[PDB]
Ligand binder design. Sequence first.
Ligand SMILES: [Ca+2]
Ligand SMILES: [Ca+2]
Ligand SMILES: [Ca+2]
Ligand SMILES: [Ca+2]
Ligand SMILES: [Mn+2]
Ligand SMILES: [Mn+2]
Ligand SMILES: [Mn+2]
Ligand SMILES: [Mn+2]
Lengths: 237, 237, 237, 237
Amino acid sequence: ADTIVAVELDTYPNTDIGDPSYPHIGIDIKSVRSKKTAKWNMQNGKVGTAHIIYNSVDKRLSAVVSYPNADSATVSYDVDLDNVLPEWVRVGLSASTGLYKETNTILSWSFTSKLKSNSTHETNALHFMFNQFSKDQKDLILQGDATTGTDGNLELTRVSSNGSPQGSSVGRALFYAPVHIWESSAVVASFEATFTFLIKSPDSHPADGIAFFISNIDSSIPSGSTGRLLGLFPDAN
Amino acid sequence: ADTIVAVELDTYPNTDIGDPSYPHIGIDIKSVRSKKTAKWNMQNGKVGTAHIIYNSVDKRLSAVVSYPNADSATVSYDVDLDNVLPEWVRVGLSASTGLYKETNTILSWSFTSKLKSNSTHETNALHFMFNQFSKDQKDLILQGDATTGTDGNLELTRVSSNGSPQGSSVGRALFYAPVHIWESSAVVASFEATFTFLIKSPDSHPADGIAFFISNIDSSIPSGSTGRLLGLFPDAN
Amino acid sequence: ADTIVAVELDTYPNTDIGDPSYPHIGIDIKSVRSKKTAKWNMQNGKVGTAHIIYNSVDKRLSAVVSYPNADSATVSYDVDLDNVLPEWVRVGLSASTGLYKETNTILSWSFTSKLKSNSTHETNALHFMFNQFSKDQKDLILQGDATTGTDGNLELTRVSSNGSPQGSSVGRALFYAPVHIWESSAVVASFEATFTFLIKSPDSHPADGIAFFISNIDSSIPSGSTGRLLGLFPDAN
Amino acid sequence: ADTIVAVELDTYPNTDIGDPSYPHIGIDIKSVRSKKTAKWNMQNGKVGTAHIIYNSVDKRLSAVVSYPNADSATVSYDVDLDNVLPEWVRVGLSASTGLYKETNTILSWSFTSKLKSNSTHETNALHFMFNQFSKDQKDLILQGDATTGTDGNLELTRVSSNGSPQGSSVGRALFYAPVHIWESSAVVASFEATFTFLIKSPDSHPADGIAFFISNIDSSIPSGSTGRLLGLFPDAN
Ligand SMILES: [Ca+2]
Ligand SMILES: [Ca+2]
Ligand SMILES: [Ca+2]
Ligand SMILES: [Ca+2]
Ligand SMILES: [Mn+2]
Ligand SMILES: [Mn+2]
Ligand SMILES: [Mn+2]
Ligand SMILES: [Mn+2]
C-alpha cells in the first residue's frame, strides 16, 4: 500500500470510524483515523484558506483553516516525518464525495520546501504557485475524477455542466516533480502549503472533504476510496 | 527601558547570573536570564550559522546553531509574542566583549516576516538579505562599536587594524525599516532570521556572545551593557 | 534639488507641457516631460495593475499597465540608471489632482531589488509586499495628503467621507528603508515593482495621475507640485 | 525533431561551423550557430557564474557570465520566444567533450519562471534551487554521461576516479517538472536561471562547453552530439 501523511478538511462525521461528531480538520499519519483533530466551522458555499506547516526543528505538523471574518480552526501534532515518509515524495490534493456530496473546488495552491545541508549550510528549495489552473496543466498529475480549466480552477471531484456536484466521486492532483522532504544529512528541513477552496453542497449535509497529502512518489487512488476514505486510504484501519 | 526578545549565542558562562556552566544558546524574554537554554559546542575560529523561527500557529520561538560537520544545538520556548512585544518593532544583531574578548563578526544576515490578514487572507511581507556589508550601509542602523565594510563583513564589536578583538566592547546593527511583527487581525504571523558568524578569540576563554533580537523601534544600547549583558539589557534582573 | 526617476500613469493631457493629447503612461527621467510614452486606455472605476522592471544587463526601464480582460499598454526606455540616480535611494508612489480630480487609491504594492557583487558573487536583496495598508503603517513615510487605513487601502490624494476625490491635492508614500539600487562593483543589479490601483472620477473627467518613483533618500514633495506635476517635480521643464 | 533555445558557454572555437576564433558565450536559437556571441575569457579551474534572463515585455534574452574579481562577458538578443518554443517546455543544463576535454562541473543551479494571466492578474510560478546535488536526485532527469553526488556536484560529462575529464562525452540534467514558459493570454511572463560551474582542463586545452537550455518536454540528447554540438543539436546547421 501507499504511505500517506495528510491534513484532512473533513466535512462529514463518520463516527463509526472514529471521526468526532462535527466537521473537523485532522492530522492523518498512515491512517484515516486522525492522530489529532480540531472542530471546524465549515461554511457551505464560501471560499476558505488552508495553511499547513512543518519544520524539522520543532518536528510538528500544524494546519490552520479559516474563512474571512471568522475564527480559524488549528490542529497540531508532534511527528518526526523522517520516521514516517520516504526521503523523496510527491505532494498533492485529494477530495471525495459519497452518498452526500459537495463541490471540491481548488482556487489556488502553493507549496515551498527547503533543505539546508549539514555539511555546507547551503540550501535546496522547491516552490510552486498556482493561482490559475489551465485545461492542460502539464506540471500536475491528475488522478480519478479531477479536472482543470473550468473557470481556471482545479475541480477535484465530479461536477456537472450546470454546477451540481456528483456523489461517489474521487480525484487528486499531484505536483509533477518529486520533492526531497527530509535528508539525514540536513541541519534544517521545512515545508509549507497553502490552498484556497470552495466547498458548496445542495445536500442536507456536505460530504466528504479535501486533503493536502504527501505520499510515495508513485502513489495512486486506492480502490474503493470514495466517501469517508477521502481518496487517501484503502480502508479505515 | 526597552522591551527585548532575543536568541543569545552566549559564549561565556556567568553562573552568578544564572547562565549554565558551559557555552550555550538561550531564548531571552525581557531578561538576560534565559527562559530556556541548550548547551552549545562553540568552535573558536570557525564560521557557524544561526537559524531562528517563530510562527503564530505554534506560538513557539526556536533556534538552531551549527557548524559544518558537527551536531547542531537547538532550543525552543513557547511564548505568545503578542503579549510581549509591541505591534511594530525593529530587528537587529547585538554583541559584546568584557574582560575576555572575541571577534563578533557577521558574514551574512537575512530575515523574512509575513502577516496574513483575518479579513482578506492576503499577506504583508518583508524580506532582506545581506551577503555583503558595505562601508556606508544605509539600510542598517549601527550602534556603539559596530562597523561595516572590513572584508565586506559587519564587525559588531571592536577589532583593531591587525585583527585582534578588544575588551569591554559593545555594538549592534538594526535593519532600518520597522517590522510589523504581530497584528490582532492576522490569521497567521511568522518570521525567520538566519545569520552566519565568525567568533575568534586569542584568550583562554572567549566572551561574551552574539544575539539576534527584536525590540521597540527606538531601542538603543543600555548603558553599562558590555560583557555578560550582551548589549541587550541594563542589568541582570 | 531632488533627483527623480518615475513611471507615470498620466490621466490628463497637458499638451502645453509636452503630454500627448490622450491619457498615457510614460517614463520620466528627471523631468515631467516623459522620454517615452504610450497611449493608455484608462478604465474609470476599475482596478488596474502596473508592473515596472529594470535590470543592469539590458539597462532598459519598462512598464506595463493593464486591466483584466483588456489589452495592456507598455512603454520602455534605454537608460543607465548608474548615471542618473544616486547609489542609495528611496522608492515610493505619488499622485495628485489639480483643477480636476480622481481617487488615487492603491490596493497593493510590492517591490524587490537585488544586487550581486563583483568580488564574491553573492547577493543583497530587499523585498516588501503590501496587500493591506493599516492606519498606522510604520514602514511607510507618508507625505502631503496621503493616508492609510480606509478599507485597508492607501489613498494618495484627498477623498472626502462620502467617497468623492478632491481637487488640488498631492500625496506620496515612500518605503521607510533606503534601497541600494546600483553599485559599480556589482555584476548584476535589478529591480521590479508592482502595484494595483483604483482611479475613479465621478464626473468622468479624471486628473492627474499616479506614479511609481525612485528618488534621493531625503526627497520631499516639491513646492506647488499638485496638478500636472504629479508630486514629483518643481516645474514642468 | 527537438526545439532548442540555449545560452552556450563555448570553450572551443569551431571556426568551420561559424564560431568566432576565441572562447565565447552565445545565444542559440534552434541552431548551434549562435545568433549573437561575445568574447569570453574563461578561467581554467576557477568557479564561474552564469546568469540568464528573459521577460515578455522586452522580449530580450540576455546572459552574463563572470568570475570573481574579473570583468563579465554579456550577450543579448531580441527574440519572441512565443514564436520559437512550445508553450510547455523543460529546462536543463548540458555539456560535452570531443577530441578535447574539460570537467563540466556544476556546483549550483537555480531557476524561476512566472506567468501573470490576462483575465485575473494573478501569477503562476515555479522556482527551484540546487546548491547540493545528491546521489539519487529524483527531481532531475539525467541523460547521457551526467551524474550527481560526487562532492555534492553535478558532473555533466565523464570524469575518471582520479579527477581527469574524458573526451567524447555528453550529458544533460533536466528539471523533472514541465515549465509553462509562455501563454498567449498572460500579461507578463519572465524567467531567470543562474548556475555556477567549474571547468578545468589539465592540459589547458579545454572543450567543448556548457549550456543552459530550454526544450520540448520530451527532448533527448541528439544522436552524435558530443564535441562541438554541446548535447543540443543533431547537426551544425
Ligand atoms: Ca469523515
Ligand atoms: Ca554569559
Ligand atoms: Ca498630464
Ligand atoms: Ca565550439
Ligand atoms: Mn475525519
Ligand atoms: Mn546566557
Ligand atoms: Mn504625461
Ligand atoms: Mn559557439
